[PDB]
Amino acid sequence: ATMALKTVDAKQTTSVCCYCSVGCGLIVHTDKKTNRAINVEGDPDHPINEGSLCAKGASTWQLAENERRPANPLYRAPGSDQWEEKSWDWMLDTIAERVAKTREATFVTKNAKGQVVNRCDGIASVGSAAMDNEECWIYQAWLRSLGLFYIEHQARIXHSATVAALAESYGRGAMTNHWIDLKNSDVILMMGSNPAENHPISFKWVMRAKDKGATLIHVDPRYTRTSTKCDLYAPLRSGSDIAFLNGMTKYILEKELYFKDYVVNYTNASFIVGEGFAFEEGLFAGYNKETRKYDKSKWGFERDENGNPKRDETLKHPRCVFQIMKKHYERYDLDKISAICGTPKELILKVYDAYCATGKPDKAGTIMYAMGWTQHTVGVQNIRAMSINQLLLGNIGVAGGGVNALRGEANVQGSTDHGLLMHIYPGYLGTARASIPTYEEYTKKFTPVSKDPQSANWWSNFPKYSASYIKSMWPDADLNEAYGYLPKGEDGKDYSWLTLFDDMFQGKIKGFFAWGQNPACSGANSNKTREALTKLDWMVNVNIFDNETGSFWRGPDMDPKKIKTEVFFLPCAVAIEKEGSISNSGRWMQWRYVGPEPRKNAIPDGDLIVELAKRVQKLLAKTPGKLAAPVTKLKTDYWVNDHGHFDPHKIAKLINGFALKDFKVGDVEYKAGQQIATFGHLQADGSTTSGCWIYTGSYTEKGNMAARRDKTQTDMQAKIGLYPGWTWAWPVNRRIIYNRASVDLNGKPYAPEKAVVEWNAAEKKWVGDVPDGPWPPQADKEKGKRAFIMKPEGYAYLYGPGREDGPLPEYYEPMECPVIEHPFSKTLHNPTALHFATEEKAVCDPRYPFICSTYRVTEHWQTGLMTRNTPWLLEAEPQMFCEMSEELATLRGIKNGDKVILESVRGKLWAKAIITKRIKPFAIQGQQVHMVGIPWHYGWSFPKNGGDAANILTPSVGNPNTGIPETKAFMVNVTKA
Amino acid sequence: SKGFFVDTTRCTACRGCQVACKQWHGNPATPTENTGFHQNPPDFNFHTYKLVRMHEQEIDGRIDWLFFPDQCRHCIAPPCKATADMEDESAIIHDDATGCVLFTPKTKDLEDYESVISACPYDVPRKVAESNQMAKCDMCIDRITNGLRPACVTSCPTGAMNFGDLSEMEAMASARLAEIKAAYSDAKLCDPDDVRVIFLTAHNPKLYHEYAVA
Ligand SMILES: Nc1nc2c(c(=O)[nH]1)N[C@H]1C(S)=C(S)[C@@H](COP(=O)(O)OP(=O)(O)OC[C@H]3O[C@@H](n4cnc5c(=O)[nH]c(N)nc54)[C@H](O)[C@@H]3O)O[C@H]1N2
Ligand SMILES: Nc1nc2c(c(=O)[nH]1)N[C@H]1[C@@H](S)[C@H](S)[C@@H](COP(=O)(O)OP(=O)(O)OC[C@H]3O[C@@H](n4cnc5c(=O)[nH]c(N)nc54)[C@H](O)[C@@H]3O)O[C@H]1N2
Ligand code: SF4
Ligand code: SF4
Ligand code: SF4
Ligand code: SF4
Ligand SMILES: [Ca+2]
Ligand SMILES: [W+6]
């Protein structure tokens, strides 16, 4: 009409939400005069969200345009009770000096055992899935050049179990399908997840499946916003999931609901297991009761003359995996599951019947699960059980199927891909250790061998990736010399979040980077984690807002005069003020652009890293100390433009990789300087760089695939929503991994109405998705390959002998208290767990009678630093709360909204009571077990009456006193305040 | 003229609409505390035009959680305006092209604001503290006359919010009600003949909000 839009003359750019891993597109409008955002909303054209956003994405404008962002760097001197503003130059040069001096003082060339390790033991780093891919990569590169081995972030806590379990089963740790693909599911099982709150836009697709006739199932100890939409909601006791899942396996096998052809073709069901395998009363064969470890060699497969596992494809051999499974699972009858899970038998059966109906070749069931328990001795086998069930039902590699292991942060996929974890370099390459002295030994160790020519065994390519990674960092060094620049971890020593904070507490860590994380709220046992920070000589904290970590020295019960720690707080840019990429849960690598400029005077992470690295290089170039080479030889020129600034296009091209010298591979010729087109062309001889081999193909001579916005689809692609022209997914744009298993041996789809790939015999090519493995169909004995190309034989593992606690999942009670016996064996708790009382009866303190769990709400993010500082979100969820049943509330004389005190042996906090019918006590063996729940989104720094960290109450996953939180279950009392 | 169809059976209470409305209009957050519920703020106020109401309800022995993303209904024959018109016909605009009922700042000059608020069967309009000025949902009038949909509708991920010509929305509402009437024998549309924002509920409207229907 007449009305003008606030945005008419604004600069319009695109971005991608910086909160969860759904990857929603944004449109940003920036005032050309002020360079500030005037509007931020959804991108209607983005195929995943179609312009929709949950509370969090919708609030983005408030994240950027925020007066609580410290405008200038802040320095806290030893013993001081206040921040002091300092110039960027002072801060950057000072940090550079601290890094150089502390590195030198704690650097080990040769360790006490006489091994060359070239490792810095006194500096550690956490962070961060919040950074762009190009920032994550240069960050790990910088840290490794410094000799750091303590390099961790988010992914260690919630996705390490997933990686371990799924890599065992399928060959990779990633989410197998993608968000839009959920619409193709016939049955969606959400278990150990709450996607309507934690991955909200996923519900667009989940509800689209429901519109098509899909059955939605939620299995969760609480009824949540997700539950409201489900056909079946099943409550089950915390940590009892394995019983529920193994009972499903029994049901699948006994009722013959499995998809036989798929099982024979694509799983290890036919493998003959050796005579050493056995299982008796909860223990697999090979158990050493003094070490509490298993001798896994007892579980190996029987091999033929060529060294390949023998197979009985009839699945009848008494030692074939299939028959071993039949025997193993017989104990998981329904009565037992109902008793131990607390779930009515009738309801379990409803879930089993509904879900197991997807074992038909043309049907697909999916499982959405996210964090699960953080203890691997609970989590890993639970995910394995899910993975097994999916293989038996032929659900892996098909449209609407998969293990949709939902990623957490917007770029946790990327920060994991880029090796911000102690045990892997970018591209999932194992990190060097003291007992691996030479590059030749390193490649020999990590390159698997199969003599079976029908098995792709794709990791045989390892040396191409290790050379390319090493060259991307030290391109002018030869590989043997450059390998020696990589710091080597002490043999058998854990450098993860698990022990990083314990070591910091013990005084071993002098300098610490808290880069884009808030461990004072996110680490287990906040009281002790906060005290651990006081042992540091210095900390560099890079974040959007002042926070519980950077200002730990002025937190609860702290006397600043007694805290010696020097703190450097560096205010950073927010996502819409940055250009780079982030990779979503579906592995979609998405390019984002600058809308508003970095709010004065914040600096984006990439530039902060560039500035620190260059300054430290110049100090070491003048004064080399013990070992300057890895530091000074690092090719930081690859990271910057001609003006010395962070260049995301340059870094993304390095991550993809390019030729360092002319070479030829097959029929393809490369000239020095050219981008490599696919990881299949990378070179073992040092001829190529590639910061992360899984990204080779993302940014080639044909351009930036991650910046593509092409919605063109073939009819086939459109039927299932692949959108292969929209951005780019690793590996090589295969949107549904394991897709060779969606077709028969001839290459014909099992589900013609929602086919993923199909072999075109006349053209000798696969159409639809990019085939996960491009070779001819498996029926082609001469040229074809098996479906699971990352596995050594090409078969997914039902029976998975690599897991430290057993080749098949087995139920054990996850908690000591209260004491609950289970009916599956005489082995009460996981025999590989070390934190349990064994010889004595557990001694359960009546002071802490209730189980407390921590979880999220839709409106807040992580420790809440970001969303507590976002008024619109804080308005919706302004305070720490405690959800409890009517029964418990009555027992404790609590009324709705009362302030209550939660206390555990570790500490205590207040919360506002939310009495809800959505939680009910669990009844197990004559016992009424009460579980209450709290969010972990609050912290003392803001707002004044918001509350503090749930982790004040938590212990670690193990014997550690700090570290990885067992976030799902811990003992407390709840009392009216 | 325009309308909305709000299908509460598809709402996940993601609160995208609540935030989106504020983001588009520049509305500030208002003071809240947690008093035992996830819903917040507790009610409409001068700065909050879209409010996701949330109510636990035991239905047929099973717990459920009912959501209602409340906003002005844009009444076809708006009683708020009818009342205000006795004082000043320019205080509340009734836009012919869209059907939008637009509270303007001219409301500040109304001597009798209480009568305007009480005339609303849905208890929607709200006064700012310092004067008689009142505000509420403006149907995103600027967006809808400039080729865009309302902020709340655009933001909604599950298709709970829908916007278009009134007739199309009326037809959509009726068809959707028909699709669930069997399973949800108490489902109904809320005053479908009298308002432009039409809510579908699966149970007694008053289980969603005391003022769900007139
Ligand atoms: N809105 C929002 N979304 C987020 C985040 C956020 O902070 N806020 N964080 C992101 C991150 S980093 C991650 S890793 C993911 C985590 O995503 P989720 O794992 O979905 O997160 P939670 O909310 O912690 O737990 C999910 C559900 O597990 C239930 N639960 C607890 N114990 C058990 C159990 O023993 N068995 C079963 N079956 N269920 C159980 C809880 O009741 C809860 O409903 O979310 C991401 N998304
Ligand atoms: N009891 C309990 N404990 C748990 C969990 C639980 O469920 N229960 N969850 C665990 C997991 S799954 C997660 S991933 C982990 C997250 O902790 P953290 O990263 O410190 O949180 P965060 O600091 O709040 O969020 C990430 C940070 O990113 C910043 N950020 C965002 N964008 C940027 C950027 O561009 N650059 C930089 N440098 N930083 C940025 C945020 O401000 C935030 O601090 O907390 C575990 N702990
Ligand atoms: S938080 Fe997740 S679902 Fe919500 S708008 Fe951002 S990416 Fe989308
Ligand atoms: S719902 Fe109330 S405020 Fe909105 S048009 Fe109708 S009478 Fe007026
Ligand atoms: S139509 Fe516009 S003003 Fe009304 S509730 Fe939705 S976003 Fe707010
Ligand atoms: S945006 Fe849609 S699903 Fe989210 S709260 Fe609003 S109406 Fe409900
Ligand atoms: Ca199937
Ligand atoms: W996480």
Tab-separated table of N, CA and C in Angstrom, chain A residues 471 475 477-479 638 658-664 669-674 676 683-689:
chain	number	residue	atom	x	y	z
A	471	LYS	N	51.631	-31.931	4.688
A	471	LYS	CA	52.037	-30.918	3.712
A	471	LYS	C	51.206	-29.634	3.795
A	475	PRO	N	54.546	-27.439	4.101
A	475	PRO	CA	54.652	-27.848	2.692
A	475	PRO	C	56.091	-27.908	2.201
A	477	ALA	N	58.768	-28.930	3.959
A	477	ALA	CA	59.564	-29.904	4.681
A	477	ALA	C	59.320	-31.247	4.051
A	478	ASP	N	60.236	-32.188	4.205
A	478	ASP	CA	59.886	-33.496	3.697
A	478	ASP	C	59.069	-34.204	4.756
A	479	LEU	N	58.340	-35.226	4.345
A	479	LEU	CA	57.359	-35.844	5.226
A	479	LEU	C	57.972	-36.430	6.489
A	638	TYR	N	49.596	-19.439	3.931
A	638	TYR	CA	48.451	-20.092	3.298
A	638	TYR	C	47.119	-19.587	3.871
A	658	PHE	N	45.377	-28.678	-2.785
A	658	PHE	CA	45.844	-28.346	-4.135
A	658	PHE	C	47.191	-28.993	-4.431
A	659	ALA	N	47.588	-28.978	-5.694
A	659	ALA	CA	48.842	-29.584	-6.084
A	659	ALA	C	50.032	-28.707	-5.666
A	660	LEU	N	51.025	-29.327	-5.035
A	660	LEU	CA	52.279	-28.643	-4.722
A	660	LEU	C	53.273	-28.824	-5.878
A	661	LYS	N	53.070	-29.874	-6.675
A	661	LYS	CA	53.879	-30.144	-7.868
A	661	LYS	C	53.007	-30.795	-8.928
A	662	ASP	N	53.455	-30.758	-10.170
A	662	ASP	CA	52.683	-31.378	-11.227
A	662	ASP	C	52.698	-32.871	-10.962
A	663	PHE	N	51.583	-33.524	-11.234
A	663	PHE	CA	51.505	-34.967	-11.110
A	663	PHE	C	50.321	-35.447	-11.901
A	664	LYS	N	50.260	-36.755	-12.130
A	664	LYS	CA	49.161	-37.348	-12.865
A	664	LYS	C	48.598	-38.495	-12.019
A	669	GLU	N	45.476	-35.044	-15.052
A	669	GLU	CA	46.712	-34.333	-14.828
A	669	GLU	C	46.462	-33.064	-14.028
A	670	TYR	N	47.353	-32.825	-13.071
A	670	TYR	CA	47.316	-31.646	-12.234
A	670	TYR	C	48.582	-30.836	-12.381
A	671	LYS	N	48.428	-29.523	-12.354
A	671	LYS	CA	49.557	-28.620	-12.368
A	671	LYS	C	49.694	-28.006	-10.982
A	672	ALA	N	50.929	-27.755	-10.569
A	672	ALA	CA	51.183	-27.073	-9.317
A	672	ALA	C	50.222	-25.890	-9.162
A	673	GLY	N	49.610	-25.786	-7.989
A	673	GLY	CA	48.689	-24.704	-7.726
A	673	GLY	C	47.213	-24.985	-7.960
A	674	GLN	N	46.893	-26.078	-8.638
A	674	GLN	CA	45.499	-26.361	-8.944
A	674	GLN	C	44.811	-27.063	-7.792
A	676	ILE	N	42.552	-29.742	-5.876
A	676	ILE	CA	42.311	-31.157	-6.192
A	676	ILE	C	40.812	-31.396	-6.265
A	683	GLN	N	47.660	-37.442	-2.937
A	683	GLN	CA	48.883	-38.190	-3.146
A	683	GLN	C	49.631	-38.494	-1.879
A	684	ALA	N	50.131	-39.713	-1.827
A	684	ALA	CA	50.898	-40.185	-0.697
A	684	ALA	C	52.346	-39.661	-0.705
A	685	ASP	N	52.819	-39.169	-1.853
A	685	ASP	CA	54.245	-38.792	-1.970
A	685	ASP	C	54.570	-37.338	-1.630
A	686	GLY	N	53.590	-36.585	-1.144
A	686	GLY	CA	53.841	-35.196	-0.809
A	686	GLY	C	53.488	-34.186	-1.893
A	687	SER	N	52.959	-34.675	-3.003
A	687	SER	CA	52.550	-33.839	-4.122
A	687	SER	C	51.312	-32.982	-3.897
A	688	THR	N	50.536	-33.294	-2.857
A	688	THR	CA	49.317	-32.536	-2.577
A	688	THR	C	49.150	-32.086	-1.127
A	689	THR	N	48.525	-30.927	-0.958
A	689	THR	CA	48.041	-30.559	0.361
A	689	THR	C	46.572	-31.010	0.406
